[PDB]
Amino acid sequence: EKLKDKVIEGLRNNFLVALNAPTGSGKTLFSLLVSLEVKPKVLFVVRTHNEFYPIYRDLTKIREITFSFLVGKPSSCLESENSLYKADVIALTYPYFFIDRYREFIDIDLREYMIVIDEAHNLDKVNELEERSLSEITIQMAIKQSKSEESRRILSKLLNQLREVVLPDEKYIKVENVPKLSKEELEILADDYEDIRKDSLKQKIHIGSILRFFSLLSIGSFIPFSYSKRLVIKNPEISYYLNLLNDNELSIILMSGTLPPREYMEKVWGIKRNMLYLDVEREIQKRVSGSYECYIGVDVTSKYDMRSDNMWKRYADYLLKIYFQAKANVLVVFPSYEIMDRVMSRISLPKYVESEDSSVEDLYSAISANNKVLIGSVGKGKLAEGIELRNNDRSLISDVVIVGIPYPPPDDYLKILAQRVSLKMNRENEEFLFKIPALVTIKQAIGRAIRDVNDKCNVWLLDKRFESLYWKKNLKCLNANKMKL
């Protein structure tokens, strides 16, 4: 609209551009038009292979434009471990742009391109891409599949090592004592990937994934953490994955439905160059998303001090109670898979607890005319992106439930994040460290409910803590009806 200039000006003017555009607001198309007015080629960096369609579509509808899709390396082999360069507009997935070792994979300049990163509220969980991990489970299938002999010797010694360094706790516990493997021991194992990468192929070999795990560990930046019975090397440094956005030689546009506050991007994401932060709401001075009713539970909370079995009983009743009264499916959001269980293991209703796999079909295979379904999902990626809710033209979900507060746990991974940011974990950063991230999850969820300007739905904030005026303000909903039972 008016933006189309304030932006094209900024891009050419070399400022980094952020756009806070609500769900189904026309977003995608905008950058399309505006990019082909700032630079020749246009690059699209998206969450998953799904987002690729709103491209081709909004792309095919352009006057004066050859597209070049790109599906993962694994889903093509005629675990990623050609006629592209001839495209005016290409589309990639997070990795092919953020993984140093995945960019060179795709020989690209980027300069000739207008870079558009979609749903950039994920730049935090971008470290997630590279994390590798060991689970007693692999250390096993890795032994059954063992053409070599003395590879199972080290393969069980490790299984032992592992066990000594992992707790079920659903939080990142820093690990010192990390199973050790001498280069020679690697050999025995590397040559076992051989006899395997032969006889078996003479017709996924996860004995190398173990290797990838130690290979990556070799670097040095990554840190080992025990997260739910699995070892996990993960690089806490964020501004080590997003520093690419500072290169003043790159025109960039960051957009999402719930982009984080300017300072967050500064203090957390480590984004230094000049920035033009434009938000649709404060612009056309109107709400573009879809309205929703606010009901705040105040006889419940997920906080440690008050949580118990009686507590989980309550919640199960809320779900039960919010289920029927609903006009359609219900999407419930838990802070951890643990809680999602004690509350869900109560409900004798038609549920679907996404977890680990939960295939594409799986989900709609769960809402397969089964009428209302109480869908469980924990606020940590997995279930999200591309998965709209649009079928015969009706947001399949009428109610979005938030059980407790999806604040991030103050664990070791969180503590190494605050120190790599010289952002003292005190009071001043409560927001950036916990609140803000917690605010994205919820909103990223109320979003999967609405997709139009009219499209309405209920939002249940089940946790006394939500009646504070802060939450009421930040989750576009002051006029909120309180309630018990």
Dihedral, 351, 354, 356, 361 alpha carbons, nearest 10: 100
**Is there a single domain that holds both residue 360 and residue 243?**
no
Overall domain count for the chain? 3
One-letter identity of residue 456:
K
25 assigned binding-site residue = yes
Query: 436 CB contacts (<8 Å, ≥6 apart)?
Result: 260, 261, 264
**Is there a single domain that holds both residue 136 and residue 49?**
no
21 assigned binding-site residue = yes
Q: Alpha carbon of 485 to those of 27, 179, 314, 469: distances in Å? A: 41, 50, 8, 22
**Is there a single domain that holds both residue 228 and residue 303?**
no
Q: How many Å apart are CA 193 and CA 151, to the nearest integer?
A: 10
DSSP 433: I
**Is there a single domain that holds both residue 326 and residue 302?**
yes
27 assigned binding-site residue = yes
24 assigned binding-site residue = yes
Q: How many Å apart are CA 427 and CA 437, to the nearest integer?
A: 15
Q: How many Å apart are CA 453 and CA 24, to the nearest integer?
A: 8
Locate 114 and state its tokens.
């207008």
Q: Which residue has the tokens 């739905």?
A: 457
Q: Are the beta carbons of 297 and 471 closer than 8 angstroms?
A: no
Resolution (A): 4.0
H/E/C letters for each residue in 227-256?
ECCEEEEECCCCCCCCHHHCCCCCCEEEEE
23 assigned binding-site residue = yes
* Residue 103, domain CATH: 3.40.50.300
Q: Are the beta carbons of 300 and 484 closer than 8 angstroms?
A: no
Sheet with 16-20, strands from edge to edge, namely 67-68, 89-93, 41-46, 113-118, 252-256, 16-20, 275-279
Q: Are the beta carbons of 261 and 428 closer than 8 angstroms?
A: no
258 assigned binding-site residue = no
270 assigned binding-site residue = no
What SS3 class is residue 67? Answer: strand
One-letter identity of residue 406:
P
Question: Within its chain, how far is the Cα of 398 from the centroid?
Answer: 23
What was the experiment behind these coordinates? X-ray
DSSP state string for 11-57: HHTT-EEEEE--SSSSHHHHHHHHHTTT-SEEEEEESSSGGGHHHHH
Q: How many Å apart are CA 327 and CA 340, to the nearest integer?
A: 23
**Is there a single domain that holds both residue 66 and residue 153?**
no
**Is there a single domain that holds both residue 114 and residue 248?**
yes
Question: Within its chain, how far is the Cα of 474 from the centroid?
Answer: 21
Give the number of other CB atoms < 10 A from CB of residue 191. 15
22 assigned binding-site residue = yes
Domain that holds residue 13: 1-130+235-288
Q: Are the beta carbons of 132 and 98 closer than 8 angstroms?
A: no
Q: How many Å apart are CA 182 and CA 206, to the nearest integer?
A: 20
Which of 159, 166, 196 is CA-nearest to residue 181?
A: 159
Q: How many Å apart are CA 46 and CA 166, to the nearest integer?
A: 33
**CA-only gyration radius of the chain, Å:** 24
